[PDB]
């Protein structure tokens, strides 16, 4: 959920040739291919209904359903560290939900705020000034920076330009195939 529903919600908008073929989709095709769901009861849906909001980031909504009724059902009690594994989890919920609007909701976002982003989700400014810096180099995102002002101008334009590149998801898988045709021929 933190190495798949985050690492791979970047290339899932029409760039499929990095899909790791052993993940939650073991079970994510199951507890989604059901005609009825509500407030989850099992482990996996109670490990999903905060994941589904970890797509609509909601730092509030996702942190509030790994600590709902698990401290009886072995999350907090059992992991023999009384409260701290949540202080770990909460942090990897707080932080891994600032790395989301960055990767998902950036379309009309040109001028954005990175002081108020610290006020929204309550992580340390340096522990947000690090990953907001990481967001550019580590994930090669189309967004510019002058971080004496603590800002990230985007100038992304890819939206109906990645559609003709979503034609190159397959226009490559035409002319990437002619590379493989005459390997067999001779």
């Amino acid at each position: 959920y933190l190495v798949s529903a985050m690492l791979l919600e970047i290339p899932y908008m029409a760039a499929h040739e990095s899909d790791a073929r052993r993940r939650m989709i073991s079970k994510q095709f199951h507890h989604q291919l059901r005609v009825g769901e509500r407030q989850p009861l099992l482990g996996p849906p109670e490990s999903m209904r905060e994941h589904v909001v970890a797509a609509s980031k909601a730092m509030k909504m996702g942190d509030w359903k790994t600590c709902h009724s698990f401290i009886i059902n072995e999350k907090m009690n059992g992991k023999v560290w009384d409260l701290f594994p949540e202080a770990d989890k909460v942090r990897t919920m707080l932080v891994r939900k600032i790395q989301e609007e960055s990767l998902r909701t950036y379309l009309f976002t040109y001028s954005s705020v990175y002081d108020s982003i610290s006020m929204e989700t309550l992580s340390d400014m340096f522990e947000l000034d690090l990953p907001t810096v990481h967001s550019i180099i580590s994930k090669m995102i189309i967004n510019e920076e002058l971080m004496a002002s603590l800002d990230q101008p985007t100038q992304t334009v890819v939206m109906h330009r990645t559609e003709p590149t979503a034609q190159q998801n397959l226009a490559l898988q035409l002319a990437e195939k002619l590379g493989s045709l005459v390997e067999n021929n001779e």
Binding site: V133, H134, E145
Partner: protein
């Protein structure tokens, strides 16, 4: 690793000639003390690299430095005690044992040129044994060792004497501060390190720290001598599994050669599997200063990077060794944090940059100019205001695939039109 199996039963149980100590409690720059103290453990009888450990600070305890190395340097050891008025009169051993040798060594140095001018393999084999004995006894007498391991090098007991006398000779030449005859012996270490030996982990870690010792005290173009000091022994960063690896200035000379003398396109080799994972990360815990050089630097940090990299450089200059790999490494810690930034970003007010980097906006103008002519910082300059824009983003990348579809198929189905 493979040999970490054999390490599992040793775990730092080496046996070289120098045994015990390095000049105890100093005050400040506290990481430098043990990182050279542990080289002195496996290196050899250093000798003004001791008085380099002196000048650092003040206390007194220069006493047991080389006074327990007597067979060579007899007077300078008996000197150093009365240099500080220390009555340890029990030093009257070498006036006997050195005087005892004369009549023997006299016969041997007149069997020397019955072996040289003749060119006799067996009259030489005689003189060989007798001097091979003397060389391990005291071959400093490194002028005599330079005479010895220049001709037929081989020793009668072809292993341990050609090990220790040649190893002690490499060291001894350095203790007199001779380099070119230390550099032929350098290649005669390149011999025994790769031959190799019985080659147990006690000899593996020995011989890996061994060839990195002369790389510590830089004399030659060790900028070039880096590729030689790195590409040996399943080329690890530290050379050893032995997580207590203490020749760990490796990264300063790897980064010297490839950033300062080469350039780091080409950072792939220097950083990725040479820095992050285990051995260098064990050293990233050890050392306070040259932690930050790859801790903020892997975090891809922008200005607070250049802050800690500047405070790094200000005591990088305190690389108080036979140094010769300094301002290259200093100005190129500034150079690479510059080029990592100048790869990607939007723009900068170079008045701010200059304030952040501790120069003036005039230098900042001339400095972006000299990087545009370098063609590494790929952008054009605004004249005065100091807003040299950095605006590279791809547009319509179909050109590759467009002509690519007919770069192969359009001229490879013309293959079919000749039948």
């Amino acid at each position: 690793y493979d040999l970490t199996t054999r390490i599992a039963h040793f775990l730092d149980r080496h046996l070289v000639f120098p045994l015990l100590e390095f000049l105890s409690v100093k005050e400040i720059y506290n990481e430098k003390e043990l990182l050279q103290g542990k080289l002195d453990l496996l290196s050899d009888t250093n000798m003004v690299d001791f008085a380099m450990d002196v000048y650092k600070n003040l206390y007194s305890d220069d006493i047991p430095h080389a006074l327990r190395e007597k067979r060579t340097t007899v007077v300078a050891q008996l000197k150093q005690l009365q240099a500080e008025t220390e009555p340890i009169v029990k030093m009257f051993e070498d006036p006997e044992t050195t005087r005892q040798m004369q009549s023997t060594r006299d016969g041997r140095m007149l069997f020397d040129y019955l072996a040289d001018k003749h060119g006799f393999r067996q009259e030489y084999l005689d003189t060989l044994y007798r001097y091979a004995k003397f060389q391990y006894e005291c071959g400093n007498y490194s002028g005599a060792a330079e005479y010895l391991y220049f001709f037929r090098v081989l020793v009668p007991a072809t292993d341990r004497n050609a090990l220790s006398s040649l190893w002690g000779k490499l060291a001894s030449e350095i203790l007199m501060q001779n380099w070119d005859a230390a550099m032929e012996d350098l290649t005669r270490l390149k011999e025994t390190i790769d031959n190799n030996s019985v080659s147990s982990p006690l000899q593996s870690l020995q011989q890996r720290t061994w060839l990195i010792h002369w790389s510590l005290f830089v004399f030659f173009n060790h900028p070039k001598g880096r590729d030689n000091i790195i590409d040996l022994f399943l080329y690890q960063p530290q050379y050893l599994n032995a997580i207590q690896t203490m020749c760990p200035h490796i990264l300063r000379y790897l980064t010297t050669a490839v950033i300062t003398n080469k350039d780091v396109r080409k950072r792939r080799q220097v950083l990725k599997d040479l820095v992050k994972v285990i051995q260098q990360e064990s050293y990233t815990y050890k050392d306070p200063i040259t932690e930050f050089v790859e801790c903020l630097y892997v975090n891809f940090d922008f200005d607070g990077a250049q802050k800690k990299l500047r405070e790094c450089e200000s005591v990088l200059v305190n690389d108080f060794f036979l140094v010769a790999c300094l301002e290259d490494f200093i100005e190129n810690a500034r150079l690479f944090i510059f080029e990592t930034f100048c790869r990607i970003h939007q723009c900068i007010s170079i008045n701010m940059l200059a304030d952040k980097l501790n120069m003036t906006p005039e230098e900042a103008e001339r400095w972006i100019v000299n990087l545009i002519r370098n063609a590494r910082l790929d952008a054009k300059i605004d004249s005065k205001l100091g807003h040299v824009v950095m605006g590279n983003n791809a547009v319509s990348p179909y050109q590759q695939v467009i002509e690519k579809t007919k770069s192969l198929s359009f001229r490879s189905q013309m293959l079919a039109m000749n039948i």
